[PDB]
């Protein structure tokens, strides 16, 4: 049956992504980009992400 399977990596750098709890986002470090999950599902794609304000930047270091 068809169903719902996405490889979790950033769509730009392909790499691993931090998970925000408290905002329910996806994280790539290297790019500053905040991904949304809407609806319990990862937004993989650029146009969905959000650059990283520096007040954010301070918790992953
Ligand atoms: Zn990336």
Same mark, same amino acid.
């Given at each position: 049956?068809? &169903?719902?399977?996405?490889?979790?990596?950033?769509?730009?750098c392909?790499? +691993?992504?931090?998970?925000?709890?408290?905002?329910? $986002? @996806?994280?790539? &470090?290297?790019?500053?980009?905040?991904?949304?999950?809407?609806?319990?599902? +990862?937004?993989?794609?650029?146009?969905?992400?959000? $650059? @990283?304000?520096?007040?954010?930047?301070?918790?992953?270091?």
């Amino acid at each position: 049956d068809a &169903k719902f399977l996405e490889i979790l990596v950033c769509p730009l750098c392909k790499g +691993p992504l931090v998970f925000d709890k408290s905002k329910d $986002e @996806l994280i790539c &470090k290297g790019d500053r980009l905040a991904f949304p999950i809407k609806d319990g599902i +990862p937004m993989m794609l650029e146009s969905e992400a959000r $650059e @990283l304000a520096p007040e954010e930047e301070v918790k992953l270091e």
